[PDB]
Structure formats: C-alpha cells, structure tokens
Design a protein around this motif. Structure first.
Motif, mmCIF file in Angstrom:
data_model
loop_
_atom_site.group_PDB
_atom_site.id
_atom_site.type_symbol
_atom_site.label_atom_id
_atom_site.label_comp_id
_atom_site.label_asym_id
_atom_site.label_seq_id
_atom_site.Cartn_x
_atom_site.Cartn_y
_atom_site.Cartn_z
ATOM 1 N N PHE A 26 0.826 -1.227 0.000
ATOM 2 C CA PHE A 26 0.000 0.000 0.000
ATOM 3 C C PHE A 26 0.857 1.273 0.000
ATOM 4 N N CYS A 27 2.187 1.129 -0.145
ATOM 5 C CA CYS A 27 3.111 2.253 -0.088
ATOM 6 C C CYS A 27 3.059 3.113 -1.362
ATOM 7 N N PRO A 28 2.751 4.418 -1.210
ATOM 8 C CA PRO A 28 2.671 5.291 -2.388
ATOM 9 C C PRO A 28 4.034 5.533 -3.065
ATOM 10 N N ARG A 175 -5.328 8.053 -3.191
ATOM 11 C CA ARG A 175 -5.714 7.756 -1.806
ATOM 12 C C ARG A 175 -6.649 8.810 -1.163
ATOM 13 N N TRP A 214 -8.263 -0.371 0.767
ATOM 14 C CA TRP A 214 -7.769 0.915 1.246
ATOM 15 C C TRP A 214 -8.176 1.153 2.702
ATOM 16 N N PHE A 217 -6.478 -1.448 5.196
ATOM 17 C CA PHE A 217 -5.105 -1.070 5.475
ATOM 18 C C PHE A 217 -5.055 0.155 6.423
HETATM 19 C C1 LIG Z 1 6.551 2.641 1.997
HETATM 20 C C2 LIG Z 1 5.611 2.622 3.223
HETATM 21 C C3 LIG Z 1 4.845 3.904 3.311
HETATM 22 O O1 LIG Z 1 5.404 4.977 3.327
HETATM 23 N N1 LIG Z 1 3.434 3.734 3.331
HETATM 24 C C4 LIG Z 1 2.454 4.734 3.354
HETATM 25 N N2 LIG Z 1 1.172 4.508 3.125
HETATM 26 C C5 LIG Z 1 0.459 5.738 2.997
HETATM 27 C C6 LIG Z 1 -0.995 5.651 2.780
HETATM 28 C C7 LIG Z 1 -1.557 4.427 2.297
HETATM 29 C C8 LIG Z 1 -2.918 4.317 2.025
HETATM 30 C C9 LIG Z 1 -3.714 5.421 2.212
HETATM 31 CL CL1 LIG Z 1 -5.390 5.262 1.874
HETATM 32 C C10 LIG Z 1 -3.202 6.651 2.675
HETATM 33 C C11 LIG Z 1 -1.839 6.762 2.957
HETATM 34 C C12 LIG Z 1 1.218 6.853 3.167
HETATM 35 S S1 LIG Z 1 2.869 6.462 3.458
#
Ligand SMILES: *CCC(=O)Nc1nc(-c2ccc(Cl)cc2)cs1
Ligand SMILES: *CCC(=O)Nc1nc(-c2ccc(Cl)cc2)cs1
Lengths: 233, 233
Positions: A26-28, A175, A214, A217
C-alpha cells in the motif's frame, strides 16, 4: 504477496534479463516505481517488505531501510523513489516517460518540488482536533498544482499526454477518496479532471486498489499494526 | 556585485547566447550553480539578490523566493540548486559533470541524499548554547556516512578518481567548516579530510574560493541578522 519480516530468508540473486523491486503493497512511494515498471513494460519480480517488522538482511539493500529498492543481475542497488523511476526510464527501452528536453525535464522536477509537501501532510493526517488545519493545508498545496495545469493549458502536468511527473504525484491523489478528502479538490477543477484522466490510463487502472482494501489497510495503520501491509492476502 | 533589494529595478532582458543567475555572494546553494557554470565554461551574468531584503519583482522569478535561479533569452526560469546544475550539464556543451551511465548517475543522486541533513545542520549552527555540542555530534554522525561512501568506493572523489557533479554539489558546506570552527568534526573521517584537500586543488573550486576574513565578516553580520551581510566587502 505476503511480506518478508524479521527472520525471513534473504532472496537469491536476480536472474539475468530481470530487475527486482523491494516494495510494500500500500506504499505510495514504492507505487511510483511499480507504475514505471508497468508503463515501460519492464520484466521484473516484486518482493514485499514489512517495514514495521524489517528483515535484518534488508539493511544491506538500503541504509535508509525504506522501499522502493531496485536490484539487478549485477547486484547493483538503486533506492529513493524518484531516483528509481529516472534509472528505469534511462536504463530500459521503449517510450521515454521523462522528456528529452533539458528545460522540460527541469520543469517536471520543479513540479515535483511543488508537490513535496503533500506526502508529509498525508502522513500527519493518518497519524485529533486538527483534521481541519490539515484540510486547509491540502487546499493551499493543491491550489499551487492547479495553477500549474491552468498556466500549462493541458490535461497532464507534462502536456496533453501522460508522463513521468503524473505517475510520480498520482499515488497520493489515488488515496484522497479513501482518506475522505475529496472536498480538498473542490476549488481545483483542472486537478479534478486530471484525477479522472489518470483513472482512464491503462497503467494506472492495472495497479488500482479497491476502497475495501484501502479502508482495511488504513484501520490497521491507525492501530500502528505490523500486519497492516498484509491486508487481505 | 552589490545586491538588489526592496526598491531596486528588475533587470533587463537576458542577451541571446547567455544565461543569468540570481545568486547571493556567500550562499552555498547558489555556489553549486556557480561551480557548474565555471567548470563547464558557460557564458553568464550574475545578479546578486539580498534574501534578507528581497525585491518585490523577485517572487515572479521564483515562487519559493530563493536563489539560485537561472534565466535565459526566452525568459525560461529554472530554480532548485540541484535542478539548475543538472540543466546546465544537459543544456551546454563540453565534458559532462554527471556520468552518462544510468546507475552511476543514480549513485551521485543517492550520495546527494546521504548529504541532505548537513545543510540544515549548518543552518541551525549559524542561528545559535549547549546546543553547539549536540550539533557537532550530529555533524560527526553525518560525516561518518560520507566516509563509508569513500571507503566502499575506494576512490578520492564521491564519483570516481576524478572530480564530478556530486563533489561540486556537496563541497560548499565543507568549504565553510574551517570558517565555522568545525574542523574537529572531520577528525574521525580520514578519507573525507583527504577529499577536502583534493577539492581545494581543483582549478574550478580554487577560482570560486573565499578568504577567511570575508567568511568571518559575513558570519558576524549573519549572526546579527543584518541585511547588509551579503554585501560584505
Ligand atoms: C513505503 C511505506 C509507506 O510509506 N506507506 C504509506 N502509506 C500511505 C498511505 C496508504 C494508504 C492510504 Cl489510503 C493513505 C496513505 C502513506 S505512506
Ligand atoms: C542562499 C542564501 C543562503 O542560504 N545562505 C547561507 N549561507 C550559509 C553560510 C555561509 C557562510 C558560512 Cl561560513 C556558513 C554558512 C548557509 S546558508
């Protein structure tokens, strides 16, 4: 797809004619590199890393202990999401995502700086009464991006066709709906149109995530769970 | 050479076959861009901006209100010191400061990220206490990361046995260590001490050097938050 954490065995060498990406589902940031790999049709293997339970061997792949990380047959390692995207574009055949022109290439990189505040704001929003201030901060940042498109008089941040800069900023806008922040683009019409254009793109479409995945997670992220990146399968 | 501040007239058009740099005489970020211009033998005009008394027209040149800013005959503007330095290398003839190899180019960019903490630390040291001991220890931690690069590289410079883009990019902060009375922060990093000595021998570095008297003069005025600081001489 299930992430490798503490105690997992390190993977073997990368087979010839292939590249490896150390990602997180899920990492952007890791998504940027995954969008380039798909767009350029590059053959690759994905290895998911649990960043909330990192394997000890992963420290040898990247000193910062972050994903994405590219690894080739010669054992060469490339980290930093923007750096991996540029590497792939330069090292692999096909249509270039980054424009050949030095000034246009500079513009994309200048637009990337105008976006630099959004990932940190997103992070703060995921981590009490100050959802209101963050929403107002998002609007201020999105207005700058809208001004780009307005002046450019094109659908995308690099012309009337899609390019590198679009793929680089896209995962955070992807997201917004899941974060319940659609109202933050109400004053930015061209940016709302750009988000719609992105969803029509075959590469973007292929790598899309459901609202259920989404939300799943996010619930686990808000609980600071190590099992968050393994939501579903 | 006298800086333009509030009330100064904006400059005329950039003559054809020339580029303009909006600089600040003691600014390490604009020094990056000035080191590339010299190294590549590019024809250019320098316009010094007083960032402690910015002219109102300067915000039209850069929304971030920072130097360096490149401006050409076509009125095209390029900002961000790293972006300006890459643009010049791509847009002008001569020997390339950035390596053609995608992986080696990526390494330069990866090393640049390992250095990213130093400029902010330098800034905190200039704006003030027992916090000076903590900053010195932070510098050592950072410098150790750079020593690990040189150790693994087994070369004199950060991009090989010859000077390249990455040396010019990190050099201005090390050039100011002696003036900041921070030479003890490289005592545990022998290869980095040797690299600093190699840099001073480079003709481009040598040409753009500043005296200790000018360094101390500017610093005293910088500690007093004087607008007249960048016009020390
Ligand atoms: C590489 C790990 C990392 O920085 N993951 C993150 N995930 C988000 C995130 C994921 C899903 C949604 Cl809906 C919002 C934000 C931001 S940083
Ligand atoms: C572009 C303006 C700017 O950021 N200037 C700065 N000057 C320094 C500095 C200059 C001289 C010495 Cl000896 C130390 C630090 C840092 S940022």
């Amino acid at each position: 797809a299930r992430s490798l954490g503490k105690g997992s065995a390190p993977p073997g060498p990368v087979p010839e004619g292939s590249i490896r990406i150390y990602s997180m589902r899920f990492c952007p940031f890791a998504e940027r590199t995954r969008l380039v790999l798909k767009a350029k049709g590059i053959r690759h293997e994905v290895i998911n890393i649990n960043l909330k339970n990192k394997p000890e061997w992963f420290f040898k792949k990247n000193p910062f202990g972050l994903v994405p990380v590219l690894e080739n047959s010669q054992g060469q390692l490339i980290y930093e999401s923007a750096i991996t995207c540029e590497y792939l574009d330069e090292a692999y055949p096909g249509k270039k995502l980054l424009p050949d022109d030095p000034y246009e290439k500079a513009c994309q990189k200048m637009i990337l700086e105008l976006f630099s505040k959004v990932p940190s704001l997103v992070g703060s929003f995921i981590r009490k009464e100050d959802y209101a201030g963050l929403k107002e901060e998002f609007r201020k940042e999105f207005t700058k991006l809208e001004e780009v498109l307005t002046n450019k008089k094109t659908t995308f941040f690099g012309g009337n066709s899609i390019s590198m800069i679009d793929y680089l900023i896209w995962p955070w806008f992807e997201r917004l709906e899941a974060m319940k922040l659609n109202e933050c683009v109400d004053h930015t019409p061209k940016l709302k149109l750009w988000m719609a254009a992105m969803k029509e793109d075959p590469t973007v479409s292929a790598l899309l995530t459901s609202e259920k995945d989404w939300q799943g997670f996010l619930e686990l992220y808000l609980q600071n769970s190590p099992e968050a990146c393994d939501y579903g399968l």
